[PDB]
Design a protein around this ligand. Structure first.
Ligand SMILES: [Mn+2]
Ligand SMILES: [Mn+2]
Length: 116
């Protein structure tokens, strides 16, 4: 029943997607909690796929998850910045593209965070 700008209404293929949620502004040396929302919009499940989070292009954390049809999982990770500046958080699912999906172009999320 969930529908948003990242989810539109086929059941013969899975469709992995990712979205990042959390503070867009954080203070140096302060614990920040983010959430990676990984969903399978398709009618076929995904026994195993990799999810990765990058901060300014450098890998930060990795997960191996499974997602049944129309299932969503919330992955979490904490981040305590040490320096200030504009950081770009990226999240990817099936980056190695080992899963044939309805869309391979909605497998990447971008989220900007300002550390002050
Ligand atoms: Mn996809
Ligand atoms: Mn894929």
């Amino acid at each position: 029943t969930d529908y948003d700008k990242l989810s539109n209404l086929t059941f013969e293929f899975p469709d992995l997607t990712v979205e990042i949620k959390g503070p867009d502004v954080v203070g140096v040396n302060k614990l920040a909690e983010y959430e990676v929302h990984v969903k399978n919009l398709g009618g076929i499940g995904v026994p195993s796929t990799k999810v990765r989070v990058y901060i300014n292009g450098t890998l930060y954390k990795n997960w191996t998850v499974s997602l049944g049809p129309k299932e969503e999982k919330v992955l979490t990770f904490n981040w305590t910045p040490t320096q200030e500046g504009m950081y770009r958080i990226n999240a990817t699912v099936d980056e190695e593209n080992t899963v044939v999906e309805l869309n391979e172009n909605n497998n990447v999320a971008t989220f900007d965070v300002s550390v002050v």
